[PDB]
């Protein structure tokens, strides 16, 4: 079925991120980590991808954000710049929505659209289908209500699952990102 069991890879994590020993939860950290340059490596925001890689299909995970003042979510294309700053744009291969200063929910289209949400998810699932082109985000804890739904996308070759626990503020928003048991 489409659900899948994620873990995180490490050779993409930026250096300001902990991983968890089982990888499957993430967090910002204090200070920077001491670890390779590599060419994986998201060097400019604190992001890591999972170790996943989707060709086709229907896949569906879930991820606990309960508390966190910012986070974002989602997938992105294998393909995707690791080095420099960019846009968290659907125009450069990412399909992500995000939160930010506690109560600013964003979906990441260029421009950006504002997402108004009732009832603030502690869960959120992402559905990738593939085939049909699209990226859907699920308010678990809001019986499952549709956040924003990417369609018409642009899919060659895998595709990532995509995290983020936040940037970095001065480390008040230290909560971990949780995949959950599915
Ligand atoms: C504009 C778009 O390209 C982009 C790129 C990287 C990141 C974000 C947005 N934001 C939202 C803006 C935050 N900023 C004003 C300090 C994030 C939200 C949650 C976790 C990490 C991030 S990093």
Same mark, same amino acid.
């Given at each position: 079925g489409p659900m899948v069991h994620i873990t995180l890879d490490?050779?993409?994590?930026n250096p300001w991120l902990i991983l968890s020993?089982?990888?499957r939860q993430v967090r910002l950290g204090?200070? &920077?980590q001491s670890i390779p340059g590599n060419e994986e490596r998201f060097d400019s925001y604190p992001? +890591?991808?999972?170790?996943?890689?989707?060709?086709?299909?229907?896949?569906?995970?879930?991820?606990?954000?309960?508390?966190k003042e910012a986070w974002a979510l989602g997938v992105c294309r294998d393909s995707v710049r690791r080095k420099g700053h960019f846009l968290?744009?659907?125009?450069?291969?990412?399909?992500?929505?995000?939160?930010?200063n506690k &109560?600013?929910?964003?979906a990441g289209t260029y421009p950006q659209t504002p997402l108004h949400?009732? +009832?603030?998810?502690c869960q959120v699932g992402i559905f990738l289908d593939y085939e049909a082109g699209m990226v859907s985000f699920y308010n678990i804890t809001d019986h499952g209500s549709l956040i924003y739904?990417?369609?018409?996308?642009?899919?060659?070759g895998p595709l990532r699952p995509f995290f983020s626990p936040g940037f970095n503020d001065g480390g008040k928003n230290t909560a971990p990102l949780t995949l959950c048991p599915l």
């Open positions: 490490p050779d993409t994590a020993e089982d990888r204090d200070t &920077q992001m +890591v991808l999972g170790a996943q890689h989707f060709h086709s299909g229907k896949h569906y995970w879930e991820v606990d954000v309960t508390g968290l744009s659907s125009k450069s291969g990412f399909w992500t929505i995000w939160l930010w &109560q600013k929910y964003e949400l009732q +009832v603030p998810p739904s990417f369609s018409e996308c642009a899919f060659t």
